[PDB]
Design a binder for these strands. Sequence first.
RNA 1: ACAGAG
DNA 2: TCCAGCTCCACTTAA
DNA 3: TTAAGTGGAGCTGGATGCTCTGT
Lengths: 49, 209, 42
Amino acid sequence: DYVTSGITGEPLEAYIYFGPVYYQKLKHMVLDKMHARARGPRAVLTRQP
Amino acid sequence: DDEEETYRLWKIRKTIMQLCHDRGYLVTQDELDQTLEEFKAQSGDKPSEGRPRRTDLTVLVAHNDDPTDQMFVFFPEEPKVGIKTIKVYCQRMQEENITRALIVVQQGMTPSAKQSLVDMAPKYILEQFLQQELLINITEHELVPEHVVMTKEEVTELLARYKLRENQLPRIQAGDPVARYFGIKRGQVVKIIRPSETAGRYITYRLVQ
Amino acid sequence: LILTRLLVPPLCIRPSVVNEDDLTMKLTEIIFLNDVIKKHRI
RNA sequence: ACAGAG
DNA sequence: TCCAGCTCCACTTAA
DNA sequence: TTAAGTGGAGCTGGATGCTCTGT
């Protein structure tokens, strides 16, 4: 398709492929994966985190 | 055969001459350049040619250190040499007052004879060579660098230049083929001249231990 | 090299909630068998 | 002890 | 699932 | 004849990737 740039308003030189593609959301989310430790609880046998 | 057997007795003799020359024994220019068709003149084909006591060498005197320091080379005919044949060569060596000899065995040496060479005497030292090792001069092989046995006055500079003890140098075994070839013993140092990929050279050192 | 006596490690080597560590249960069995052998001699 | 992720 | 040491046992030399 | 030093064959004990993320 003939595509116009949304930043500059001038048209794009190449034609851009446009269509509906099925996209599925995966269970891996960054909110369930961000982690940080400053200092905290330690094991009883080896006194390391 | 007979064509092939004489070829070995020429190549083996040729290598022993270069071995004796590289150890610093007096070897003449016509011994080193002895040609196959010239070998056929003093000793010819196999019926006339004799292996046990014709091709023996004793002319080799250590012309650097002293003309009385002398060495044999012997070519046994039995493929496995027993202590009897060793005792034969030892008493001949005892009579001449020569202290070094080379024994060139054809297939091997029996275990009780091998033990004798360790303990017959420290002042009567004999080196086993298999003839299958002497058919190719390893000092002319493309993978083997130039080895040079260093003098004590140069070892004392090596250890002074780096401030080393002897036991921090890299090691070379006495059982190494090139250690056997030069006949070096424990506590000698060899200079080794490795070739670079460029025109240059790198110098390294090893200790016999 | 032949052990006629054996040290038992401090408690912090083998913490109280693993309940007891496998070293502590081995040392119980050694002590029990030492009582078995001593009695059977009598 | 099993499944995942890179 | 693949690989170095250790030990047992036949196999010549040598006295 | 046999004492002994050394070959060849079987037994034994060792090893086999890095982490988080949950039940």
